[PDB]
Design an enzyme around this catalytic site. Structure first.
Site, PDB file in Angstrom:
ATOM      1  CG  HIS A 176      -1.746  -1.240   1.362  1.00 30.99           C
ATOM      2  ND1 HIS A 176      -2.759  -1.577   0.490  1.00 30.99           N
ATOM      3  CD2 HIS A 176      -1.695  -2.231   2.282  1.00 30.99           C
ATOM      4  CE1 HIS A 176      -3.293  -2.724   0.865  1.00 30.99           C
ATOM      5  NE2 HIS A 176      -2.664  -3.145   1.947  1.00 30.99           N
ATOM      6  CD  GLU A 215      -3.995   9.457   3.026  1.00 27.17           C
ATOM      7  OE1 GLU A 215      -3.668   9.385   4.216  1.00 27.17           O
ATOM      8  OE2 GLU A 215      -4.578   8.541   2.409  1.00 27.17           O
ATOM      9  CB  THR A 267      -4.987   2.548   5.385  1.00 26.19           C
ATOM     10  OG1 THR A 267      -4.237   2.460   6.605  1.00 26.19           O
ATOM     11  CG2 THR A 267      -4.226   3.384   4.400  1.00 26.19           C
TER      12      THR A 267
HETATM   13  N1  LIG Z   1      -2.273   6.672   7.156  1.00 26.82           N
HETATM   14  S1  LIG Z   1      -2.176   6.770   8.648  1.00 26.82           S
HETATM   15  O1  LIG Z   1      -3.530   7.208   9.153  1.00 26.82           O
HETATM   16  O2  LIG Z   1      -1.032   7.643   9.088  1.00 26.82           O
HETATM   17  C1  LIG Z   1      -1.847   5.172   9.311  1.00 26.82           C
HETATM   18  C2  LIG Z   1      -0.956   5.022  10.374  1.00 26.82           C
HETATM   19  C3  LIG Z   1      -0.668   3.775  10.913  1.00 26.82           C
HETATM   20  C4  LIG Z   1      -1.263   2.618  10.403  1.00 26.82           C
HETATM   21  N2  LIG Z   1      -1.015   1.347  10.851  1.00 26.82           N
HETATM   22  C5  LIG Z   1       0.118   0.964  11.540  1.00 26.82           C
HETATM   23  O3  LIG Z   1       1.013   1.712  11.935  1.00 26.82           O
HETATM   24  C6  LIG Z   1       0.257  -0.552  11.821  1.00 26.82           C
HETATM   25  N3  LIG Z   1       1.478  -0.759  12.595  1.00 26.82           N
HETATM   26  C7  LIG Z   1       1.598  -0.883  13.918  1.00 26.82           C
HETATM   27  O4  LIG Z   1       0.684  -0.827  14.739  1.00 26.82           O
HETATM   28  C8  LIG Z   1       2.867  -1.066  14.254  1.00 26.82           C
HETATM   29  C9  LIG Z   1       3.578  -1.064  13.130  1.00 26.82           C
HETATM   30  C10 LIG Z   1       2.719  -0.878  12.130  1.00 26.82           C
HETATM   31  O5  LIG Z   1       3.031  -0.818  10.941  1.00 26.82           O
HETATM   32  C11 LIG Z   1      -2.161   2.775   9.328  1.00 26.82           C
HETATM   33  C12 LIG Z   1      -2.453   4.036   8.787  1.00 26.82           C
HETATM   34 ZN   LIG Z   2      -0.689   7.588   6.131  1.00 32.85          ZN
END
Ligand SMILES: NS(=O)(=O)c1ccc(NC(=O)CN2C(=O)C=CC2=O)cc1
Ligand SMILES: [Zn+2]
Length: 257
Positions: free
Chosen positions: A61, A103, A196
């Site tokens: 992604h 975004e 996401t």
């Molecule tokens: N795009 S965003 O809103 O900044 C967004 C931010 C974060 C995540 N997911 C994660 O960080 C999942 N994750 C963990 O919990 C630990 C490591 C890892 O990859 C998904 C989206």
């Molecule tokens: Zn992000």
């Protein structure tokens, strides 16, 4: 599974993730004239001196630069935040063209890309527990525009050839995320969500007003990445952004006059 295509993109996500139509979804358009200066906001503190990067991963992604978050090192505090939030990863969202990719939008303006530095609230012990809480995460969002090259981004750009396809990773130690910040820490803030799936409503968003400049050549290398795995038909990793969602019952606050 979910993605950014016509058949699995943002308009489909609500079927498997009904919170997609929730009350605090991200991203949003930032109406700069409606956002109100908030004198209750404390000074924002970005302390990345001891940040310890480990690895870079193409997850199908985007790509994530991952940090060792086992000790209290790279921390975000102050501003709208209560307590201390620890850096775990950063990644970007970007477009197929310079005219789209961010975004968040600013008075409906789309930037070429957006950097997300993801932090978890240390009161919840780890990031997996933190994301289940309304104040679990803080994401620092930084806009990218195309112009002068960002010297601090080039080490990221140069490793992308080694993680072209989904599931590939590379050692990525000693990367200093301070090289990705603009001069000013002026920001907007609001309560939101992951952008996401699973779209969890657990994020305090802090979006910096000043974009960073990256070169056309730097962003062109982002666009050579693949959504697909090795040995599968090429699908260029572009337009991996969710569009702006309804603000609903939320106020965006400004740190500046
Ligand atoms: N795009 S965003 O809103 O900044 C967004 C931010 C974060 C995540 N997911 C994660 O960080 C999942 N994750 C963990 O919990 C630990 C490591 C890892 O990859 C998904 C989206
Ligand atoms: Zn992000």
């Amino acid at each position: 599974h979910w993605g950014y295509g016509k058949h699995n993109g943002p308009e489909h996500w609500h079927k498997d993730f009904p919170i997609a139509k929730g009350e605090r979804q991200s991203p949003v358009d930032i109406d700069t004239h409606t956002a109100k200066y908030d004198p209750s906001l404390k000074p924002l503190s970005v302390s990345y001196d001891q940040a310890t990067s480990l690895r870079i991963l193409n997850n199908g992604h985007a790509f994530n630069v991952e940090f060792d978050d086992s000790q209290d090192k790279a921390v975000l505090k102050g501003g709208p935040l209560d307590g201390t939030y620890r850096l775990i990863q950063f990644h970007f969202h970007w477009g197929s063209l310079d005219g789209q990719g961010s975004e968040h939008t600013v008075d409906k303006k789309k930037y070429a890309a957006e950097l997300h530095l993801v932090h978890w609230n240390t009161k919840y012990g780890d990031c997996g527990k933190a994301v289940q809480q309304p104040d679990g995460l803080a994401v620092l969002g930084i806009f990218l525009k195309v112009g002068s090259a960002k010297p601090g981004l080039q080490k990221v750009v140069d490793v992308l050839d080694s993680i072209k396809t989904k599931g590939k990773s590379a050692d990525f130690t000693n990367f200093d995320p301070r090289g990705l910040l603009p001069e000013s820490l002026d920001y907007w803030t609001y309560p939101g969500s992951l952008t996401t799936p699973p779209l969890l409503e657990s994020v305090t968003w802090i979006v910096l007003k000043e974009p960073i400049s990256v070169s056309s050549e730097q962003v062109l290398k982002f666009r050579k990445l693949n959504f697909n795995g090795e040995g599968e038909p090429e699908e260029l990793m572009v337009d991996n952004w969710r569009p702006a969602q309804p603000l609903k019952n939320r106020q965006i606050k400004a740190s500046f006059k």
